[PDB]
Structures are given as C-alpha cells and as structure tokens.
Design a protein around this ligand. Structure first.
Ligand SMILES: CC(C)(COP(=O)(O)OP(=O)(O)OC[C@H]1O[C@@H](n2cnc3c(N)ncnc32)[C@H](O)[C@@H]1OP(=O)(O)O)[C@@H](O)C(=O)NCCC(=O)NCCSC(=O)C1=CCCC=C1
Ligand SMILES: CC(C)(COP(=O)(O)OP(=O)(O)OC[C@H]1O[C@@H](n2cnc3c(N)ncnc32)[C@H](O)[C@@H]1OP(=O)(O)O)[C@@H](O)C(=O)NCCC(=O)NCCSC(=O)C1=CCCC=C1
Ligand SMILES: Nc1nc2c(c(=O)[nH]1)N[C@H]1C(S)=C(S)[C@@H](COP(=O)(O)O)O[C@H]1N2
Ligand SMILES: Nc1nc2c(c(=O)[nH]1)N[C@H]1C(S)=C(S)[C@@H](COP(=O)(O)O)O[C@H]1N2
Ligand SMILES: Nc1nc2c(c(=O)[nH]1)N[C@H]1C(S)=C(S)[C@@H](COP(=O)(O)O)O[C@H]1N2
Ligand SMILES: Nc1nc2c(c(=O)[nH]1)N[C@H]1C(S)=C(S)[C@@H](COP(=O)(O)O)O[C@H]1N2
Ligand code: SF4
Ligand code: SF4
Ligand SMILES: [Mg+2]
Ligand SMILES: [Mg+2]
Ligand SMILES: [W+6]
Ligand SMILES: [W+6]
Lengths: 652, 653
C-alpha cells in the first residue's frame, strides 16, 4: 500500500492519442521524494540532449507534490517540467491553487505528455475516466475564459483546469499556464504545451487520499497551524511590510511599495528612481488598489490569502498575486492603474509577467536608439501606454516584429543585431532576471544568481535575512527563537553580520559562510518543490512553520517511508544534483554561470572567483561546475557518472 | 510496501541487449495473484495472435510464484511461459528445485525476454547486478554440464542455473529447460529460448524476502509441517504405493511398477501387456534401481525428497523424478536399465521425456509399416536399444529424418504423409498425451483431456480419487477426515461411486458431478501454479496439507492483501479464464477439444456431448468453448470481452 503519493501516473501520447495508467517505482520515491525530484528522474531517463524543445520527443510533465492532497496546510503545488525553448535547459515551473490536489483525488501523481496532437485538444480526467477531447472551438480563447467554457461543456463545475492562452498556442517563449489564481509562469512551459496541440488539462477527483500514520500526521498539521497564528502575531521586527510575515510577498494586502519602486529599476531594468514614493503617489495607488481589489483569496487549504481577484472597470475579472502587480507598471514608466489593466490581457493570453514587460521595454529602447525602425512598428500609437497594449498583441500573435520579440530578449537581440545585444543586458542563461541593478557586490546573491537552476532569484532566496540589523540586541532577539536553522552556526553568522564596517559585505559573511547560507536557502526550495508545499509557508519567508526539522516527520508520517533530517538533506542534494547533471548534459558549463555584467557597480573579480570555486566544492562539483564521479556515486547517481564518462563530460 | 512478491521484474531485449528493472502494478497482484496468473496478463496484452512462436516479438517469461522465497514448505516453482512452437497455443511449464526462490532473494518476481540475440549468450543475475555474457564457448553442451562450467567460470558455486541443451539450441519443438534436479519440460519452451539465442539464466540472490504478518504465517507453515508428519504415518488405504502418499508420484522410492507396466501402453502408446509384471522382472528392475539410485533428494524447503540422483556405470550423473523413469523403457519395449541410460542423454540434450519417446516409437512404427524405409535412417544400427540412441542423436541435431521428427508426431505425420497421420493417434491440440488406451469411457477424465490448457492429464488431476472402493466401509473411512473438499457434496459422491453396477462409470458420477469434480481439481492446479506451490503438497496427491480453506490465510498473511475462500476461487477463475481467452484469440475452438478417437474402446457420443456441453456452461463459456461477455465482465475482464467483440470472436448481443 502506497501513501501520500498515489503510485500511478498517466502516460499520454498526443500523436497517437493513447492513454496509459502506469504504476510508479516506490524506490524513486525514496531517492527523489516526488514532484520536481521525480520529474527530473523522468526527464533524465527519457530526454537525451539531441531532443529539441519543439520536438515530439520533448516531454511535458504535470506533477502533484508528494504531500499534495493531504491535510498539510498550503501543500498544493503543481510542478510542470520540460525542456525550455528559451534557455534550451530544463524548465521546471510551480503552480499554486487547487489543480495538484485534484489530480491526487483523481488517483494520479503525474501526467506525462509526449508527442504532438495535430488537432487542438484538451485532456479530461475524472477519477478512472480519462479521455482526449476536441478543443478547436477553444482556439485563441484566454486561459481563464477557456476553463469556464470547458466546465460548462462537461457539466463539471468542481473541475480544475490548467490552460494556455493564445500566447501558448503561438509558442511564445515566455508563455505560461494558468489555473484560477495560479500560474506556471516561467521558462516557456506554455509554449511547449501549445506546441503539442494541448489547450487544457481538465481534472475532477473524488477518491480518498491516504496517509501512513494518521494521528501523527494531523498532529504535525495542527502544530503548523498553531505556528502560523503565533507567527502572525509576531511579524519580523524592523523589516518592510511585504516581507515580515508568512506567504508569498503580500503585495495584494500591503499598499506601501516604497522598497520596490525606489530600489528596483524601471523600464528595461534601466532606471533607478530613488525618491519616487511621494505622498501623492502613495495615496493615488492606494485608491486604485482599494477600488480594484474584490477579495483576498487563498490557495487550497491555506489561510494566508496572498492573492486577489482584481476588477478593473470594463474588464473581465482576473486573479493576481506578488510582483506582477508592478512589473508592467515599472517597465512602462506608468502607474498602478495601467499595470492592473494590461496584466489582465497578459494573464488571459498567458504570458510570463517577469519576462514580458522587459521584452517590451527592450523593444522600445531599440526603437528609440534607432536600432529598430519606426517602420517595424506599423500603425504604432504614440501614447506610451497605448504602445504597450499594441506590442503585447504583436508579440502574442507573432506578428511581424512581434514574431522576433516573441523569442525573448536574448534571441530577439541576437536575431536583430546592430548592437541590439547590448540592450539585452539583464539575462542569465538567456533568461530575464529581476530588474535589480544595485551598487555593492552581494556575495550571497552572487552565488544564487550564478547557480540557481530556476534562474530566478526570488525562487532560491528566503531563509536568511536579506540585510543585517544595525543593533546587536536586535540580532540577539532575532536568533533567540530561530529554530529553523539546520545548525547554530547560522545564528552566529547573523549575530556577527553588520550593515557597515569590518563585518559588512562584500567581505563578510566569509566565503565559507556564504556557501553554507546559499546551500541551505536552496535546499529548502528543492524540498518544497518535491513535496508540493507552498514556499510561502516554507522556503520563502523568514521563520516558516515548515522547516528542516519537522519536514522529515511530515514525510515519514505522510508517505510511510523512513526519513530524518540527514536523509532529507541528502535526498534534496540528490535531485538538486540530478537537475544539475541534466543541464550539464545539455551544454551548461561554468562559463554560463555569471550574472549580468552591470548587476553591481562595484565588482570584486577575485572574491567572486573564490566564491564560485568554494561553492562548487561544497556542492561536490569540479571547477567547471560538473558533479564529480565521486559525488555522483555517493549520491547513488552512479548511472549519471557512467553516462558522463561515456559522453566525455567527465574523464575517468 | 510490497510483501511476498518483490514488486519488480526484469525486462530484457536480447536484440538490443537492453536490461531494465520495472516495478509492477499491485492491482495485477490483486486480480491475478502471481506466477502463471500474471504471466498470462503479460502475454495477453503484449503478444497478439499475429505473432509467431519464432517471431522476435514472442516473449519468454520466467516467473517465481507469489509465495516462493517465503518459509512455505515446497513453495519453490518457476513458471515459464511463451507461445508454443508445437501447439501454437500458450505454453506454461513448471520447474521446481531451487531457481525460483533464488530469483526472489535476488530481488525479482519475473524475467521477461523479448527479441533475439544474434550471438549465443547467457544472463547473469547477482542481486542488483545484471549482465549479458557471451555463451559461445558453451555451444552444444548439455544443460547440467553448461551449469557447472558457468558456475566455475563466474566463481559462483551457489548460483542457480536454468539451461538448454543441444535440443533447445536447435529448436526441437519439445526441447526442455533444465535446472539441477528440475525441468521445465513440455510445450517447447526450450526451443523459444534457443531461438532467442539464450543458453542459460544464472541467478545468485542474497537479499531478504519479507512477509506481512510474520507470526500468523509461520503458524500456518508449522501447521503444514504437522499435517505432513501425520499424513505420512497414514497413506491412503488400499491404494497403489506411488500415489498413496504426499509428493510427486514417488517412482524413485517405490520399486513396484506393476500399475504402470500393466495398464499403460508400451511402444507408440500401442501395446497393452496385461501380465508384464512378473517376479522375474520385479527382481531385475529392483536390482537396477537399487544400484543406480545414489540419493533421494528434495526441492528447496521440502522434506518429500521425490527425486533421485541416478548413476549408471560409465555415464555422467543426472537427476530424475516421476514417470520418465518409465517412458523410454516402455516406448522401446525394453527394461529399466536401458530407460535410465538413454534418459541420461535425453536430459543433457534437454528433451521432454513424455514426447521424445513417443516420437521415436512412432518413427519405428512407420518404419515397420513401410511408410518410412531404411533409406530414411542411413547408418541405422541393428539392435533395438541401439536404434533408439541413434534416433535420439538424429532428432537433437535435426539431422535428416531427425529434422522432421524434431517437430513432434503431429507435424511429422503431416510432413511424412502416406498414411503417417493414422499413427500419430495420441495427440490433443498437436501435443502427445500419456500412453493410456483404456477400455471404458471415464467421464471425469474425458472432461480433463478436452479442456485442460496445460494439455497434460497429470497436471490437472489429483484431488478426487481415480477409482472407487469396493467396500462402503472404505469409502466412509476416507471421507471422514477429508477436510480438503470445497463442499460436502464431494464426500457423498465418493460414497455412492462403485466399480460395477448402477452407480458406476460412465453414467455415475452424473454429468453435473463430473463438472464440479473437474472444476475443483483444475482450480487447485491453477492456485499452485500462481503461488509457486509444488503440486506434490497440494493439487496432485489426495488429502494434501495445502487446500482451498487455508490457502487464503497464506496469501493474506504472506502477501498482505485481503483474501478469503470465495475471493481465491474467483481469482483462480479469473486467470484460468484469461488463459482460455488467450488460446481463443489464437484460434482455439470446441472442435480442437477432442481426445484421440481410440482413447477409450467404449465410447458414448451422446453423453460426451452432454459432458462438454455442461462443463462449458459451468465455466461460463459459449457452446463453442468461448468465455461469454457476461462472465468476462463479471471477472473484471471486460477488456477481454471488448477485444473479442472487436475481432468478431464474440457477436454483440
Ligand atoms: C535591495 C536592497 C534595498 C539593496 O540594499 P542597498 O541599497 O543598501 O544596497 P546597494 O545598492 O548595494 O548599496 C547602497 C549604498 O551602500 C553602499 N555600501 C554597500 N556596502 C557598503 C559597505 N560595506 N560599507 C559602506 N557602504 C556600503 C553602496 O556603495 C551604496 O552607496 P552609493 O550611494 O555610493 O552607491 C536590500 O534589500 C538588499 O540588500 N537586498 C539583497 C539583494 C536583493 O536583490 N534583494 C531583493 C531580491 S528581489 C526580492 O526579494 C523580491 C521580493 C518581493 C517581490 C519580488 C522580488
Ligand atoms: C486405469 C486404472 C488403474 C484401472 O482401469 P481399468 O482397467 O479397471 O478400467 P478399464 O480399462 O476402462 O476397464 C477394465 C474392464 O472393465 C470393464 N468395465 C469398466 N467399467 C465397468 C463397469 N462400470 N461395469 C462393468 N464393466 C466395466 C471394461 O469394459 C473392461 O473390460 P474388457 O475386458 O472388455 O476390456 C484406473 O486408475 C483408471 O481407470 N484411471 C482412469 C484415469 C487414468 O487415465 N489414470 C492415469 C492417468 S496418468 C497418472 O495418474 C500418472 C500417475 C503417475 C505417473 C504418470 C501418470
Ligand atoms: N514550492 C514552491 N512554492 C512557491 C514558489 C516556488 O517557487 N516553489 N513560489 C512562490 C512565489 S514567490 C509566488 S508569487 C507564488 C506563485 O504562485 P502561482 O505559481 O500559483 O502563480 O508561489 C509561491 N510558492
Ligand atoms: N502569468 C503570470 N506570470 C508570472 C506570475 C503570475 O502570477 N502570473 N508570477 C510572477 C512571480 S511573482 C513569480 S515568483 C514567477 C513564478 O515562477 P514560476 O511560475 O515559473 O514558478 O512568475 C512571475 N510570472
Ligand atoms: N505448481 C506445480 N507443481 C508441480 C507440478 C505442476 O504442474 N505445477 N507438477 C508436478 C509433477 S507431476 C512433477 S513430476 C514435478 C516435476 O518437477 P520438475 O518440474 O522440477 O521437473 O512437479 C510436480 N509439482
Ligand atoms: N526432460 C524432462 N522431461 C519431463 C520430465 C522431466 O522431469 N524431465 N517430467 C515429466 C513429467 S512426470 C511431467 S509431470 C511433465 C512436467 O511438465 P512441465 O515440466 O512442462 O511442467 O514433464 C514430463 N517430461
Ligand atoms: S501562502 Fe499564499 S500563495 Fe502560498 S498556499 Fe497560502 S494562499 Fe497560496
Ligand atoms: S514434493 Fe517432491 S517435487 Fe514437490 S517440492 Fe517436495 S521434493 Fe520437490
Ligand atoms: Mg508559479
Ligand atoms: Mg517441470
Ligand atoms: W513571486
Ligand atoms: W509428473
């Protein structure tokens, strides 16, 4: 008897229209846990480097986390995985809401899509009943719009739908997948879905989902709820609002956006506006938000209600959370009202709200520098906001210039030329970063930009504070009840750490301290992404209810496998290394692991080399960023080491 | 977590040399239990009827039964499965000894071979280590001899080896697979294995094998050991020694062979010798066997020591059990000394001891009657004994007439022509039956010859007595402690049944009594062949320690899944019916289900129709032997019914 997981996946061949339920190997659960980890095993095993993103043999995997469908608060994440058309590397992407738990109640842990459907279709799951339906009547329709039409069609009001918009259908490289108040946003996972002729995945489930140790498990869940209450009455002192509590960045609740608007860059990650947040702006954006925000709403089985239904006059309602509230606004040098309006269109089209704003601001920089012509934007309006709505439509239809921009700043620049590459200045591994151009090198963030397989800073940070406290007693207070640390050395680091002087960055924390910090922050994310646990109650906020000390108890009581703190750390390291190996096999080397040239105004080449060198060694990789044969063997990834040798990636 | 079964199989593609471990689906254990049952599910959805026996897409499966590797006494059977090159139907074949347990301790429930290796290879398993080795130095070597060379070669003296001899390498249609004192003998599984270029499968295993409810399970084991003790202090009264106790027919222990020699047909199932067993012959054969039998030896975890190492002067030692002690002897009209000598060669070649002798005896009949002439046997020696050794070599090398004879009597007859057919008079579905030509219709045995999917009367019979007692007092004594019957109906039947008179065959037992009796006897074999339990302690002998009432307890406490008598009965029904449907998909029909014209001297067309008409209904089949859509939906085999409807085998409505 399997627990927590269902022990079954669906294999779907969209070319042949075949559908097969397949029992999983319980050993893969012990080694790789579930979610992202087991996705990485499937991709390693079945997608060799000769496979292109828009090749039939590319896989699109929808995974429900190990503990999704259990009573674990906030444990509801879907992990979508494939090879990215933008980065040509592995792309995994997380989605909240209600879809993953529904897949579990239907009896499945994953759906694995291979092939391509000639006709636009959608997959319909209802417990044991699985079938492929014609979706041509859904062509071009928005992601939310599509879900609503389908639930009508099928008479399944309680079904969960993950869908693409027109942007997905047209294989826009940063096209997302949307489900109610949730989104698998980055990496172009939506483009692959469109490429396979897959319009939506509709699931309804009414079966039981069992846990192994019933009372132990519910006990841990209450422990978490108690901690969520306590923690809510005790926000982290002296820290800006949107990051003092639990949850995803609480930007739908908090009106104050001084930190973001004054420290992040506007336009094409170009312009700092140090004194932007006037009283006049604060009042105007609060008015817009109060009027537009219908309700704060939660994902499945969670009280934090991070997201919000948003209603702009004369526009369909949509749902939003976190930073997409500002990225369109800031990239366009506009106001919050504009942001919320265009975000509505872009959500329905199904576009990544991080990359898309920067692509458009990239385009207008080129148009202004004359590198692009005005004849490349035919019928172009000349009001600034109108031009953003205009280009959004060119991109989503791959129309003329939109066809090039639809490929992202890296490829658009390379395809354009005339020094367009100079303006694609905010990429790592061909993927747009957050619009941050700070002054002083940050040793911890340096390592995170360089090595993160999600290639997104907000999805590798969290557990260690972003800044030190000025006063010693503030730090003593903070580390006092910091139970989430793996080792008390993390307390001592934060005690010593100071904003200014001989114990400040970039020289302190030390290189070894920075390696431990990045390793821990990263580890927690990978655990979240295998369990399906929302980072909002785990790896993202300071002092979460889930941590390295009770996670082993959740896994043991939930899935009925042996698990403790050490074994879990090792598990996390195992599929973190496997994801690494997957990208190594696709061509990634040390050379690729470098932040934008202009990401800090003060650079320290020798400190940075020493940082990356020491981090690689901590990981157990060689100086080209490849996992060694020794590390692979000890992790039980011998088959990886063997293939590395056979492929010349490692020499014996 | 999985119990009793390991939960994994090895997928092996011999064309490409790919080796892959795959986890199984615990729902398949629920529906089909293990062993033969799950073999059948595998064959059903991976081997469609367009596939030939020697097609690279044919599958060759080695399965350890569900309870092999546990402490259950005598639970050690490998189940081999493939499509038969001789019958073109499913072939399953059981081999005892030590191989299945070892596979379980290595960590696997089955090995599934597909494709064909261009070069001769063997597969070597040692726990998680699995590799394909070149076997070319082994070409032509005997099965046991191959085993010994491999173990020394690998430095694996405790490994278990299943191997083919020359006969298998040459695709003899009745080639066997041999393993110590054990053999997967019938249906030609050895030819498929040679055809795939696979010379042996070596397995060493040293991992734990777990049960769900430790205490309950060992409790049940102790109960069987107890029953085995008292059952051996109480042989069934007034019955032939070889079949009065537990185990496979105890022919290596019992020297009294009066029963066989006087009631079975010598030669090509031809000659009865009503008074063969003289005092002079008994002393002669007793002397032979005393000298030749080195030791009585057992399969894994069993006290019955049914088999024997046999050592003939100047020959390599081999092992033997059951009726091959006599088949060569009788086919050649010879003595036991000859039987044991030629059976040594035949065993090393890897040949089925039932078919081979009849094939040779049939050849010499045709020679006598001039259908074959001396030109067909260049260099044929003069002596009778010497001729048999000559023809054995011809057949194994598919040399000359041997090439035709290596196909079995049914195909050889058709190819030889000129009246050869009339002499291939002991086949059912192109498969040689035991040399039995009785005088009066036995209605119970009529049913078992017709429908049995193993197509061998000795692997479907057992639980009901073959004959009645002369006195009622005897009948009453027997049924008093007969706890094994599924219902009490069976005790009453045996009480009424008498040798001569009103309550005697073929009219008693009635047509309905015969069907219940044949259902039960068959079901127990299918349970044994799923669990890997030796029939010698179960479906074969009267009053066994395993039976329908405690088997569910073993499955529950061993495998950790719900089971009770009714669910087990229905499970056995489920995969027995699946095997039926597989043979239907490959074209079998009621027409194929006749015994030989001459199997009994006194026949009854009317009763025989009614017998088979009734039995079909009880199984839930058509009047053409096909499982109806309703009975298929009931057994959770809707998907079978569907395919049958798609292919026009069952009409919709
Ligand atoms: C962003 C941030 C405000 C930057 O802080 P700061 O402004 O202090 O940093 P700064 O620009 O480097 O330097 C300022 C001045 O100090 C000076 N100086 C430096 N070192 C000095 C020394 N040792 N001694 C003396 N002076 C030293 C410098 O030279 C400079 O002076 P200048 O006028 O002469 O040029 C802070 O939160 C941080 O550190 N973030 C971490 C990294 C990050 O990107 N985090 C956010 C990730 S996204 C996220 O989390 C999200 C959340 C929600 C939704 C979406 C995303
Ligand atoms: C063969 C057997 C030993 C005795 O048989 P019998 O000779 O007694 O029966 P018979 O030959 O039919 O008839 C004799 C005479 O009586 C007459 N007559 C008959 N009924 C009559 C009546 N009611 N009333 C009046 N008269 C009746 C007949 O007409 C005839 O008279 P006739 O002078 O005119 O010709 C008994 O076990 C049996 O029949 N088994 C059947 C199943 C079978 O095949 N078993 C073995 C399966 S393999 C196995 O188990 C192995 C084990 C170990 C290793 C390998 C394999
Ligand atoms: N396991 C996991 N949970 C996560 C994240 C993640 O990367 N991994 N991202 C967080 C952030 S920063 C946001 S804005 C939301 C995004 O929710 P969505 O995927 O439904 O749009 O998920 C949060 N939960
Ligand atoms: N369409 C869409 N894109 C989006 C978002 C969203 O909510 N909707 N969230 C943004 C935020 S805040 C984050 S943290 C990332 C989430 O990354 P992921 O969905 O690939 O896991 O997407 C960004 N892009
Ligand atoms: N499960 C099962 N056990 C069985 C049998 C069988 O058909 N199924 N055949 C019995 C008979 S009649 C004999 S002679 C021996 C033969 O053992 P072997 O296959 O190792 O040569 O197995 C006995 N045990
Ligand atoms: N080579 C060989 N053939 C043999 C035997 C044997 O032990 N060795 N056993 C005979 C007996 S007594 C039986 S019951 C069957 C067993 O059939 P199976 O091994 O195909 O299951 O084969 C017969 N042919
Ligand atoms: S913390 Fe917020 S984003 Fe995470 S599950 Fe709860 S409501 Fe959803
Ligand atoms: S009864 Fe005989 S053939 Fe069966 S397992 Fe025991 S020793 Fe082997
Ligand atoms: Mg997401
Ligand atoms: Mg056998
Ligand atoms: W976010
Ligand atoms: W036998």
């Amino acid at each position: 008897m399997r627990y927590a997981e269902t022990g079954y996946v669906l294999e779907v061949d969209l070319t042949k229209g075949s559908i097969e339920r397949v029992a999983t190997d319980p050993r893969d659960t012990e080694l790789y846990l579930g979610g992202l980890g087991t996705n990485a095993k499937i991709l390693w095993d079945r997608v060799p480097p000769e496979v292109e993103p828009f090749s039939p043999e590319n896989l699109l995997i929808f995974a429900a986390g190990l503990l999704c469908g259990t009573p674990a608060t906030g444990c509801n994440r879907t992990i979508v995985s494939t090879v990215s058309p933008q980065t040509k590397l592995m792309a995994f992407s997380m989605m909240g809401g209600f879809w993953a738990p529904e897949l579990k109640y239907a009896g499945y842990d994953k759906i694995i899509f291979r092939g391509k459907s000639p006709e636009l279709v959608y997959l319909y799951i209802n417990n044991d009943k699985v079938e492929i339906r014609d979706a041509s009547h859904l062509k071009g329709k928005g992601a939310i719009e599509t879900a609503e039409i389908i639930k009508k069609e099928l008479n399944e009001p309680r079904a969960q739908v993950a869908a693409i918009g027109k942007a997905g259908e047209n294989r826009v490289f940063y096209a997302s997948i949307e489900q109610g108040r949730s989104s698998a946003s980055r990496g172009g996972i939506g483009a692959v879905m469109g490429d396979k002729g897959l319009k939506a995945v509709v699931v309804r489930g009414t079966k039981d989902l069992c846990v192994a140790k019933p009372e132990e498990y519910i006990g841990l869940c209450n422990e978490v709820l108690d901690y969520i209450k306590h923690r809510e009455e005790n926000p982290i002192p002296d820290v800006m609002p949107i990051l003092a509590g639990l949850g995803s960045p609480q930007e739908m609740k908090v009106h104050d956006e001084k930190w973001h608007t004054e420290n992040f860059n506007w336009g094409n990650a170009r312009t700092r506006r140090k004194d932007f947040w006037t009283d006049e702006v604060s009042h105007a954006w609060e008015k817009t938000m109060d009027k537009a925000r219908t309700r704060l709403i939660s994902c499945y089985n969670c009280p934090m209600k991070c997201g919000a239904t948003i209603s702009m006059e004369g526009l369909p309602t949509y749902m939003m959370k976190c930073f997409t509230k500002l990225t369109y606004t800031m990239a366009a040098y506009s106001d919050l009202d504009f942001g919320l309006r265009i975000a509505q269109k872009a959500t329905e089209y199904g576009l990544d709200g991080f990359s898309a704003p920067q692509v458009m601001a990239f385009a207008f920089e080129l148009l202004e520098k004359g590198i692009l012509k005005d004849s490349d934007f035919p019928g172009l309006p000349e009001g600034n906001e109108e031009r953003f709505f205009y280009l959004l439509d060119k991109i989503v239809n791959r129309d003329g210039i939109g066809d090039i921009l639809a490929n992202g700043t890296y490829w658009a620049a390379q395809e354009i030329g005339n020094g367009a590459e100079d303006y694609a200045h905010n990429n790592i591994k061909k993927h747009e970063q957050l619009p941050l151009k700070l002054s002083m090198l940050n040793p911890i963030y340096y390592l995170m930009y360089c090595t993160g397989e999600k290639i997104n800073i907000t999805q590798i940070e969290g557990q260690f504070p972003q800044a030190p406290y000025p006063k010693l007693e503030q730090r003593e207070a903070f580390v006092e009840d910091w139970i989430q640390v793996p080792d008390e050395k993390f307390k001592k680091i934060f005690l010593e750490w100071e904003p200014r002087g001989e114990k400040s960055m970039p020289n302190f924390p030390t290189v070894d301290m920075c390696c431990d910090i990045v390793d821990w922050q990263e580890m927690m994310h990978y655990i979240d992404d295998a369990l399906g646990q929302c980072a909002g109650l785990s790896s993202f906020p300071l002092k979460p209810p889930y941590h390295i000390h009770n996670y082993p108890k959740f896994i043991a009581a939930g899935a009925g496998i042996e698990m403790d703190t050490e074994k879990l750390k090792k598990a996390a390291k195992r599929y973190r290394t496997l994801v690494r190996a997957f990208n190594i096999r696709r061509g990634m080397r040390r050379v690729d692991e470098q932040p934008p040239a202009n990401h800090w105004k003060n650079r320290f080449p020798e400190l940075e080399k020493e940082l990356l060198d020491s981090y690689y060694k901590l990981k157990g990789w060689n100086d080209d960023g490849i996992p060694t044969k020794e590390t692979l063997d000890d992790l039980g990834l011998g088959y990886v080491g063997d293939e590395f040798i056979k492929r010349g990636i490692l020499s014996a």
